[PDB]
Amino acid sequence: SQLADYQQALDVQQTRAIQYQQALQALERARELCRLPDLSVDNAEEWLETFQAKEQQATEALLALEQKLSVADAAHNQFEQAYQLVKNIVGETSRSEA
Amino acid sequence: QEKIDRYQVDLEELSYRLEEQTDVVEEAGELQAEYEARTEATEQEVDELKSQLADYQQALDVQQTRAIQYQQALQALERARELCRLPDLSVDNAEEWLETFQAKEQQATEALLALEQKLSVADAAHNQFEQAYQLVKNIVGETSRSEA
Amino acid sequence: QQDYETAKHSQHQAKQQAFALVEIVQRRVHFSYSDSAGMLSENADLNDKLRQRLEHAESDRSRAREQLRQQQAQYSQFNQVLASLKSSYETKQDMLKEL
Amino acid sequence: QQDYETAKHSQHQAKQQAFALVEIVQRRVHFSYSDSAGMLSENADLNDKLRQRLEHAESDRSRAREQLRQQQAQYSQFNQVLASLKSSYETKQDMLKEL
Numbered sequence A: 001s002q003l004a005d006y007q008q009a010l011d012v013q014q015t016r017a018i019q020y021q022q023a024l025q026a027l028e029r030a031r032e033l034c035r036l037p038d039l040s041v042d043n044a045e046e047w048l049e050t051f052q053a054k055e056q057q058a059t060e061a062l063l064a065l066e067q068k069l070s071v072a073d074a075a076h077n078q079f080e081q082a083y084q085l086v087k088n089i090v091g092e093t094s095r096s097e098a
Numbered sequence B: 001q002e003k004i005d006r007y008q009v010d011l012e013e014l015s016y017r018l019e020e021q022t023d024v025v026e027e028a029g030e031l032q033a034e035y036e037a038r039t040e041a042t043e044q045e046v047d048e049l050k051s052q053l054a055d056y057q058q059a060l061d062v063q064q065t066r067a068i069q070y071q072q073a074l075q076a077l078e079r080a081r082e083l084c085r086l087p088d089l090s091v092d093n094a095e096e097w098l099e100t101f102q103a104k105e106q107q108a109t110e111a112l113l114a115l116e117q118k119l120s121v122a123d124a125a126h127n128q129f130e131q132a133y134q135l136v137k138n139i140v141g142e143t144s145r146s147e148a
Numbered sequence C, D: 001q002q003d004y005e006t007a008k009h010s011q012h013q014a015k016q017q018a019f020a021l022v023e024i025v026q027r028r029v030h031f032s033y034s035d036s037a038g039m040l041s042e043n044a045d046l047n048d049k050l051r052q053r054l055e056h057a058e059s060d061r062s063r064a065r066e067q068l069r070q071q072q073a074q075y076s077q078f079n080q081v082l083a084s085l086k087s088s089y090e091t092k093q094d095m096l097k098e099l
Helices: A013-032 A046-072 A078-090 B002-061 B073-082 B094-139 C002-026 C028-032 C044-098 D001-025 D034-040 D045-096
Strands: none
Touching: A013 B073, A013 D001, A013 D034, A046 C044, A046 D001, A078 B002, A078 B094, B002 C044, B073 C002, B094 D001, C002 D001, C044 D034, C044 D045, D034 D045
16 A cells, blocks of 8 residues: 555654654563563563463462452451360361361 | 164265255355455455556655655644544644653553452452352252352 | 453553654654645546545455355355264264164 | 462562563564664655565465465364264264164
C-alpha cells in the first residue's frame, strides 16, 4: 500500500519510526524494572516465561495462604478443644503433629 | 448364520453411506480446489492492481518538495482532537496534555495490576472449585455445589 | 474479570491517547514550515478510479477468502465423516471374516 | 501473617516485571521498524529501499505459506487417522455389547 499510494508521503514511516523509539523506550524500562541490562527482543520470551512461572508460583502459593488466613479466624477455644481431644485419644502429642 | 447375514447387510448399507460420502467429499474437494485457485487469483489481481497503481504514480509523487509534509502534522493534531476530549488542543499546550495523559496511562496500568492480583487468585480458586466439582460428578453424577 | 476487561480497554484508550499526544510533539518541527505549498492532484482521476477498482478487488478477495475458509471447513467435516465410515466398514468387514 | 504480607509484596514485584516484559512482546513487530526508522532518515527518494523491504517480506510470506500448506495437510492426515481409531473403538465397543 505504501508503494502503490506514494502520496501517503512518509506518514506511516514517521508512525513506524516513533513506534520503533517507543519499542526501544519500553525495552529500556523493562531492563530497569527486571534489572537485566543484558536483554534482546529475540530472547526476552525466555525471561518472560521464567517470570510468568515465578508469578504462577507466587499466585498459587498466595491462594493457599489466603485459604489458611481465612480459616485462622477461629477462636482459641476450638484449637484447645481439638488438641485435648486428640491428646485424650492418642496420648501426649505436639500441637504441630495434632 | 443370521449374524453373518446381518453383518453383510450392514456392510452393504455402510457401502451405500460410503458412496454417498465419497461423492460429497469429491464435490466438496472440487469446490475447495476451485475456490483456492479463485482466491489466489483474487490476491494476484489485488497485487497486479497495486503494482500497476505504483507504476502509474511514479512521476506524480516522487517530486514531493517537502511542502505537502506539514498536512500530516495537521491530520495528527486533528486525529488527537477527536481521540482526546480536548477541542482547544494546540501543538504548543500539547506537552502539558502529553504529561497529563501519561499520568492517566500509568494510573490505568497500576489499577489494572491491582485488579489482576485479585483476579488471578479468584480464577485459580474457581479452577480448584471446578476440579472438586468435576471429581464429585465423576464419582456420583449430577448434584448441586451446595451438596458437593 | 468484567472490571479488569474494562480496565484493559481503559488502558488501551489511555495508551492510544498518550501516543497521539507524542505524535503531536514529534510533529511540532513539521508544523513550523506550514506556510509552504506545492503542486497536487495532476493525475488524480485515473489514480482514484484505479484505487476504487483495487478496493473492489480487495473486497472481492475478502469474499473469496470467506468462501474458501467455509469450504475448507465443510470439506474437512465431510472427509472426517467419510474416514469414520471407512473405519466402521473395514472393522465390520474384519469382524464378518472373523465370524 | 508476616510470611503472607511478604508473599503479597512478592506477587506485586512479579506482576510489574512481567507486565513490562509483556509490553515488549506486544512491541515485537515495532522493533522490525528499525528499517522504517532508517528509511525515514533518507529525507529524499527511497522507493528502492521500500521495494527491497517488501521483496524480503514477500520471500518470508511465500516460505510461511508453503510451511502452512504442508502442516495443514499433515494435520488433516492426523485428524483422519484419529477419526479412524474413534470409529474402530465404536465398532469394537458395539461388538462387545452385542457379544
